[PDB]
């Protein structure tokens, strides 16, 4: 059990084959500060260098899973200061060789919600808020949102989520028919742990061979969608 | 300052609900919002007006009382069965898809056949708990047209579309809600109020972002639809012109 | 015979799997009799709908233990005899009335029907990965096509067992009923389909499933390429010996 460089991501081994990546940039409520960006990329590179793990649980702290762009960063784009860069926090889970469970025990906002959606198994908390809120800032969505939201939540619910940038409680999404398990926040991480243990029962090579096949169309199609979304910004 | 007026046949009313929200209210009470010539012309005219006046951010398409849209008139269906007309002769099916801004289909009343299907092309669809919805084409003996074989699986998923399209059954909105559909379902008396609120939230965004985003989200729909229409017209050539379709339309309408 | 064919009303055919000795696992007898049942249906142009169902608490249980050991040894494959695609290849609509448990390839064969009904009490599982096998028989294509990409990832990667009532609460588009109502509901639905002209049912089915039928050979090849990398290890044989029927 170890912190990354900036100490705002903590890695905990749950058994020898399960790694939990806990995001805890409390100063920024797990918004994508420079420190959370570096520590997250460090976490997944460590996972990539340590093939003992068969499953990853990605989770937040307290009431926050991940909050997406920082308020400063969004403001700077809105004005004549910076532009949207492609990055690649959003696809950490997708690029991971092994199954990733996004245990979203807390709010998932903008790029934060999108990051969780690229995981193989996503669990929501009934009391938390989830929103792809890019268009509230006046901007079309980025970070692969226009691809992964319809892929995981279906075409129709994605139109509303993306065009209107509304906030949904986990309870609201459960009642609109989402395929994600939705639980009380207090139960979200235990359930992710149980499921990771069941996944760890499989040969590692079988997990990886199947995940490579299930996500090949996503890994293959995402660069083109990123280019479209950059185009939209203009 | 916020206009409200009739289209030329008076069976569609346009109301500017706010400076950037336009409501297209179908009100062919004589035909229960079936596609009479009057309703066909006034819907085309309403969507052209919207295209000619690029200041709106959302459109609400809705019916009156307990009817959203009832589809083909009996006469209209018989004209197709006879080979006088084809469903592509006017194109009501794609009105909401070809609209450059978001459209909300507030289906506060029943949605039947082409009427339900034209609604399903909207970007956001809301159903009423107590209304009936049906892609009822196959009850008359002929295959679904109006792009139904494309937009039903796209919006409600492959599996539920199989059953809705092959069996032509009628579902309450509550039935579809229990089946797991991603559309918001509400008591009829709340459907339009909820559509207006959602249109108000959409109107908080810049119009150019909405149009840019919609173009990107529905590009596959606009790209893929024409081929499926061709295929549906070939299915009609195989199924619509049998004598028993005439007997079913006259007997079961 | 472990498959019984029963006509219902004029144009409905029920295919009833009742290999009670094997709990509707794919014994040699069930395999041969299912193939013959669907060939009889293929040669008979009276029928307008098929009801595929099992007996008591079993819909279809997938490979026998010796069958899975044959696959692990490389003597046979999950796709042999193309049982997995019988309902897709059938020219008329098929209803899988899964009044009982659906396990492994028995589940997947049912999921290629045009309409699938589950029972609340019964267990459903694409359980290939419990043994170390990657999913075969078109599972990687028909589970996401039928139940959506997200739910399919969890079903296929983890090989878990779900009650019909658990899937119902996760949001599946299938009708889920008490077991004692499943076949009665399938019969009402089949009478409703039988109201349509047969030529209309066939013409529309051919269209709605053309993408499945066109893409499925590609997907089968992709599954075979996964299976080459995964099926022949020793620990797949121990898993089959230790976990079968657990
Ligand atoms: Na004809």
Residue numbers in the entry:
A (entry chain C): -2 to 231
B (entry chain A): -5 to 247
C (entry chain B): 4 to 249
Provide the authors' original text about this structure.
In this study we present a structural and functional description of the bacillaene synthase β-branching enzymes PksH and PksI. These biocatalysts are responsible for the final two steps in β-methyl branch incorporation in this PKS/NRPS pathway. There is a single active site per PksI monomer, with each active site positioned on the periphery of the trimer, ~ 43 Å from one other. Akin to PksH, PksI adopts a characteristic CS fold, with a ββα core, that comprises two approximately perpendicular -sheets surrounded by -helices.
Two crystal structures of PksI were elucidated; the first to 1.93 Å resolution using a crystal cryoprotected in glycerol (PksI_GOL), and the second to 2.1 Å using a crystal cryoprotected using ethylene glycol (PksI_EG). The final model of PksI_GOL comprises residues 1–247 of chain A, residues 4–249 of chain B and residues 3–231 of chain C, 663 water molecules, 6 glycerol molecules and 1 HEPES molecule. In the PksI_GOL structure a single monomer (chain A) within the PksI trimer possess a bound glycerol molecule within its active site. Comparison of the active site architecture of PksI monomers in glycerol bound and free states allows assessment of active site reorganization as a consequence of ligand binding. In the unliganded structure, the active site adopts an “closed” conformation, with the side chains of Phe136 and Phe81 pointing directly into the centre of the active site cavity and His230 rotated to face away from the central chamber. In the liganded structure, the active site is occupied by the substrate mimic glycerol, whose hydroxyl group can form a hydrogen bond with His230. In this “open” conformation the side chains of Phe136 and Phe81 are seen to flip away from the centre of the active site, which is occupied by the bound glycerol molecule. As a consequence, Phe136 forms a tripartite stacking interaction with Phe234 and His235, which sits beneath the proposed catalytic residue His230, which itself rotates to point directly into the centre of the active site. It is likely that our unliganded structure represents the ground state of the enzyme, with the glycerol bound form equating to a mimic of a PksI reaction intermediate. The observed side chain rearrangements in the glycerol bound structure are essential for allowing the substrate to be accommodated within the catalytic site of the enzyme and may also function to promote active site solvation, consistent with a potential role for water as a proton donor during catalysis.
